[PDB]
Amino acid sequence: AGDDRRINLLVKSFIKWCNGYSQYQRMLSTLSQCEFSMGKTLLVYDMNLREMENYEKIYKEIECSIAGAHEKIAEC
């Protein structure tokens, strides 16, 4: 929820400058930080999808190991 507080600080700095070049630099810096956070969120989403694919890959391997283990039980 820190992006909402960053947006509130950006809106406060915009209202303060609207009523001064250092505040312009601060607005550009907060804009770039919000861009970096929005770029981060999609990478987190893609990482979650890759972990889902990895879990669904491991599940069938555990199925195959159980299928071998039953045969080992019968032979023993």
Binding site: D4, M38, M52
Partner: protein, 92 residues
């Protein structure tokens, strides 16, 4: 496409703050303030959508992780049974 619209609204807000910095008239300042406020509202809506999508993906990973843990627990039970039967036949 959501990230492209995000960066496009950021370019809009950069153009508006460059307009204010070059202008530094009340009607132009009010128009720039209204368009910038529309930009801030779009950015907040996009942030809400991003956090909702991230929480959905996190829960969707967590359920599959729980199921993999349970199925691995059954595999551990069966491997303990195999190991005990093998130790018993090497005893016998």
């Amino acid at each position: 496409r959501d990230y492209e619209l995000y960066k496009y609204t950021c370019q809009e807000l950069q153009r508006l703050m460059a307009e204010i910095q070059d202008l530094k008239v009340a009607i132009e300042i009010e128009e720039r303030r209204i368009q910038s406020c529309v930009h801030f509202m779009t950015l907040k809506k996009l942030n809400r959508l991003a956090h909702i999508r991230l929480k959905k993906g996190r829960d969707q990973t967590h359920e599959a992780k729980q199921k993999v843990d349970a199925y691995h627990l059954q595999l551990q039970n069966l491997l303990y049974e195999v190991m005990h039967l093998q130790k018993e036949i090497t005893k016998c």
